Design a protein around this ligand. Structure first.
Ligand SMILES: [Zn+2]
Length: 257
């Protein structure tokens, strides 16, 4: 099965998922000088006040913080988007070392980690139908650098001991994802894909320019998670990132000058 090891990592995924070599794959390098300001983009609207988190799950590739997406409770709209996109989960990608871990890069710079807040277009009814559409998902990507602690991340960090291994979940109610956002909502946007198999080309990416800072202790706790299940040989969950893919026939647009 696919993963992030030498024998099953990103360079192998195309054998089971040929779209891995497709025309709109993610992540990409964001070349800041080539991205063009688009004055027709609108401000992002991130409306998370009524978010209902439910559970946190180690799925063997990352951990997902899952939300109730059966009503418009936590939604993303505006920016490049037409319509309303409902938050279903967030997760991170991170490195074994502070100098790598992000999926997107900025002028080839790798951040220590990257947060993905995943939303689906309500016009398609359910996430499973949305991923079959070219405008099915909107993913808000936020870079993490190591410095000061992010207070709003600590509740996530502290539950990780209870979901160490693949297949473990824990109750995770009343978590406010607003505590993971930077000050500015300036962003880059482009059409792309899921960054894990099945790699479907269904995502409008919105990548924030401003990173958030997390502490060394916080990222060290991410690195104590395991890819394996309980009772199996320990393989630390680190370096769960796909590298940048060819931009091909795409333009990255900036919301800011
Ligand atoms: Zn992701």
């Amino acid at each position: 099965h696919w993963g992030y090891g030498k024998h099953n990592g990103p360079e192998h995924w195309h054998k089971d998922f040929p779209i891995a070599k497709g025309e709109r794959q993610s992540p990409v390098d964001i070349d800041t000088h080539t991205a063009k300001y688009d004055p027709s983009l609108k401000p992002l609207s991130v409306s998370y006040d009524q978010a209902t988190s439910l559970r946190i799950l180690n799925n063997g590739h990352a951990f997902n913080v899952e939300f109730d997406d059966s009503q418009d409770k936590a939604v993303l709209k505006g920016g490049p988007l037409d319509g309303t996109y409902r938050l279903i989960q967030f997760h991170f990608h991170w490195g074994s070392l502070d100098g790598q871990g992000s999926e997107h890069t900025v002028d080839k710079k790798k951040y220590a980690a990257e947060l993905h807040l995943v939303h689906w277009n309500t016009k398609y009814g359910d996430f499973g139908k949305a991923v079959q559409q070219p405008d099915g998902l909107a993913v808000l990507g936020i870079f993490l650098k190591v410095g000061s602690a992010k207070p709003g991340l600590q509740k996530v960090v502290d539950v990780l001991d209870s979901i160490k291994t693949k297949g473990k979940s824990a109750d995770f109610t009343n978590f406010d994802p607003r505590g993971l956002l930077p000050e500015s909502l300036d962003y880059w946007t482009y059409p792309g894909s899921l960054t894990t198999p099945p790699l479907l080309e269904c995502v409008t990416w919105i990548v924030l320019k401003e990173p958030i800072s997390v502490s060394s202790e916080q990222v060290l706790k991410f690195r104590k998670l395991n890819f394996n299940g309980e009772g199996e040989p320990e393989e630390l969950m680190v370096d769960n990132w796909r590298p940048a893919q060819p931009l091909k026939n795409r333009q990255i647009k900036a919301s800011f000058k």
